[PDB]
Amino acid sequence: KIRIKLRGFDHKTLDASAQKIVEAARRSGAQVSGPIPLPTRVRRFTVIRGPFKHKDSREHFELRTHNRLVDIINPNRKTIEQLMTLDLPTGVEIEIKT
Amino acid sequence: PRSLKKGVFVDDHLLEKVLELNAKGEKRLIKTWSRRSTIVPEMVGHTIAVYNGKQHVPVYITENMVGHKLGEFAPTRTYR
Amino acid sequence: GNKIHPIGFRLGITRDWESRWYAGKKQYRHLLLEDQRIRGLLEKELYSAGLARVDIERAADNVAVTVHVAKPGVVIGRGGERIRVLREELAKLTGKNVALNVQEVQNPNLSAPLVAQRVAEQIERRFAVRRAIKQAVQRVMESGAKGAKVIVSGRIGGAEQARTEWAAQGRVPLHTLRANIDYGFALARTTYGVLGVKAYIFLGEV
Amino acid sequence: ARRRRAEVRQLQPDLVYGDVLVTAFINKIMRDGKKNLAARIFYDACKIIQEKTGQEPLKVFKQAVENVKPRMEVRSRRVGGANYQVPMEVSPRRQQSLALRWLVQAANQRPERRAAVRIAHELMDAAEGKGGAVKKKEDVERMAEANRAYAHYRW
Amino acid sequence: EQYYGTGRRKEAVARVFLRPGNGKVTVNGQDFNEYFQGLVRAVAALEPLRAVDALGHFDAYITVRGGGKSGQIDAIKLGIARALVQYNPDYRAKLKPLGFLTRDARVVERKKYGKHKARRAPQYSKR
Amino acid sequence: ARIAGVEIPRNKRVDVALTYIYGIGKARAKEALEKTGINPATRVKDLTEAEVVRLREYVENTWKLEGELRAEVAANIKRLMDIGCYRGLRHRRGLPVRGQRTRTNARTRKGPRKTVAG
Amino acid sequence: GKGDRRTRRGKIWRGTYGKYRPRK
Amino acid sequence: ARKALIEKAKRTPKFKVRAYTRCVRCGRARSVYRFFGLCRICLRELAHKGQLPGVRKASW
RNA sequence: CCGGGCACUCUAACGGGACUGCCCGCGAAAGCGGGAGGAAGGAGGGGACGACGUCUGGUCAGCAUGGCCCUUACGGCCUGGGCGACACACGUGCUACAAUGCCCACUACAAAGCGAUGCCACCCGGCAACGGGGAGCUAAUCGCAAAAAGGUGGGCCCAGUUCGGAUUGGGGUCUGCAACCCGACCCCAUGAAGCCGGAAUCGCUAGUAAUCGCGGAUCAGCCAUGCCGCGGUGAAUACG
């Protein structure tokens, strides 16, 4: 069991990093279950537009944390040969739990 | 419906002062800026001046008013 | 009372954040504070060096502060001297062991914040604002830039009453978010008052 | 309706009869968006009205709604000072709407304790030619034939 | 053998499986009349089969979820429609003129600020 | 059906008819019906003389009741009134006690509206 | 209805718990 | 707001209750979002700038 | 639940799809009426977006800022008090005046969010608020959690009441240094006005109004019935 929890503020960045990881692991390993998408944590913030009222003008923004899962099955060495440190994306964030 | 629920809170300020005042006999007017504290039995007989926020008003403390607070007898408001 | 900030509109498509990293409940606050401190320092010192954008990236305790300059000679300095002091002063505020990066921006008249700084400079020394405006719009228009636009705030030329300035050219459609509209704000602090300078620049289509 | 004709909503047919007027009446009974409770009201009233009088509730419902539909009414028209009550005929759609509204309002102005009982007895009285809804209808018609002296203000 | 129709109505999903049989329809471990007990519009769920003369020719098993039970009933209706079409496509000639193959796209509308519920404006008095 | 200090409910359910006693609401009525071993849904007329006597036994002397209760509450008012308490002042001036606003909607405690000019 | 705090609807309106609306 | 009125930053409030948010940039006295440590005005301007990653224009 | 599998619902990333393209009609054209096909059409529904300017509109009491006044002092710390005052008047709301209703058991169906001392399954104690113990969840797996209207069953019987919960007396928990001024909550008791509201006036044209609950931000706590979102059921009517 090698869980790879992928999280980010950018969805194309998550797709890029996850697909690169899977393409690296597809040349060594199994029938890997691959890129499963998880629901996104949506944080909304409503803010009154103008300081010193006009109460009924507020606009809101939304941040969204996207999550992806990999679940590589039976990787030994060649998978982690293409894994140690080779990635471009910066806004991406990766965790590994076993 | 009023509740303090355990170790009924009385501030140290007047607590130690009055428990040492009782030992030498009853004293005259005391100074009180802490109306947050609860009245305790041994306070009966004294004359306690409490703060309105502006003034210092004396209060005769009796057996009947033990359970209440200091400040129930010092009205903050002034009307008519 | 209208016309919300254009870059805030644009952040999603055809525009990117000045800080692109990830955080959580326990980290985002003082990390954002640290970003604000970085931009504050770089606006204290590097204003006259012709800087436009500060892009900060974080992977894991790695910082990638990227300074886009119109004149990299003042940022690097002779023999690299000035990339030693304020690159160390940068780490004398944050204990994150951060390194600094420089990059070139072509046509300082093509970047809207730089044009705003330029017009604000010419305003602080009290030039006739409309000439600076039209000249800036031409500097923009003389190299691509299918649209250009300049707005100046009240008390123009020192006048008692507040006014509003003008003279855009080309086509500057702030309403539609398609075509990479860049925006910059500058603040001219003068004896008569304060003058806001808004530089809108339209270039490219998709 | 300044621009368009405001096309009439076509109600869904009914699950029991297959008739649209029943669905319209059930909507007129509904309040706070409870079409289930309103349907139960109307159908328990259907059972009661079919039992207390050995007739089909279908034709009694139809005959009652037909009896309550008025043929003339009054509208106010501003002419030479204060406005006047001018009589005129009625649209068939508006006749339908007014008939159902008077039915429900006269049913709930009745003494009967339960709602379904009110509905059933109101429908019975209206099907016989009497009751409160038909009284309001005949007062509407009595407004006509009375101010008919304004028959030249039809508009 | 068996034919499948999904259907969807107002945030409800009703997977419908149709086979031949006697006309017994079950839902989530309950008969159709025990789970929708005492609902006047529960008969509209098996309405789409009355243009094809089922309920004695057919038999069903349905699993439904989401929203309210009325949306469940209408999603059951639509799912029965699509299962009936995949069984016999000619049934379309009797289905769409009735309107049983159309996805009802009426959704609850989002709430807007400055309002109470998405269109109700707060009452003012003495303008 | 006389139970407490003068109190005669009639022709209703017993637990409901006990609310008509002063110091008894729904909770104490349910408690009386519980510990007295009486069917709550019974009418007042159908109450046994033994059931009525047991209800009298319990309700009469387990809580303080009508006259004692009214006098106890009023004497509590007089008690916190004769002391110089602020709560006593609010009871004197006829104003709300629980700590509400008196700028508007103090009607229940202050009585009908007496509109002065402005 | 909802203002009666010793009934179940007044308890769910205030969101509290007690004798008239036990948790479970 | 006022400099001394950011005395919360040295917290030592003599009592744990006296901690309030006090938006870092503007020194907001009343309305501060705890997650960003900023206030609605500072949050609005900073999200307009583009310095808060992931913050987009909400629309649905 | 397991073995196992992705077909399904789903989650979330990229796409396809509608264009008056087809037909009848009318028309010089745009386009209009009608029809088939289609999940959907004549802008399919909802947002984000608000022109040159206006009212010398709003706030220097968010910020930044140009000038004029303050300096043992308007600056500054802390305690107490105040912004909660009441013989009144309006604005916005909440709860209601009940039988399409109330209460009691029993049972079923949401979406959107939130939670590392923070959410707190579960056992125990207590009528209860809540306390003690304690598992799990770095949360499509755990928890907030029960959705509420609804369904069946039952009681109430047109009555200031098994409507309505204001007011007040007492007892008690909790956050907190501390609830007199001035908190929420629980329990017993008290059970007010109010039986659809004068002149006048407001919102809404489709899942809309109406009604029902849920969540969130701010926050130790909370006077939130506010505000910002979420879904459940689901109208009436538009001659003009």
Ligand SMILES: [Mg+2]
């Ligand atoms: Mg507001």
Ligand SMILES: [Mg+2]
């Ligand atoms: Mg600039």
Ligand SMILES: [Mg+2]
């Ligand atoms: Mg000039």
Ligand SMILES: [Mg+2]
């Ligand atoms: Mg653009």
Ligand SMILES: [Mg+2]
């Ligand atoms: Mg919606």
Ligand SMILES: [Mg+2]
């Ligand atoms: Mg709704």
Ligand SMILES: [Mg+2]
């Ligand atoms: Mg207003």
Ligand SMILES: [Mg+2]
């Ligand atoms: Mg009640």
Ligand SMILES: [Mg+2]
């Ligand atoms: Mg200042």
Ligand SMILES: [Mg+2]
């Ligand atoms: Mg605060």
Ligand SMILES: [Mg+2]
């Ligand atoms: Mg605080």
Ligand SMILES: [Mg+2]
């Ligand atoms: Mg398995």
Ligand SMILES: [Mg+2]
């Ligand atoms: Mg496949």
Ligand SMILES: [Mg+2]
């Ligand atoms: Mg057409």
Ligand SMILES: [Mg+2]
């Ligand atoms: Mg057509």
Ligand SMILES: [Mg+2]
């Ligand atoms: Mg068609």
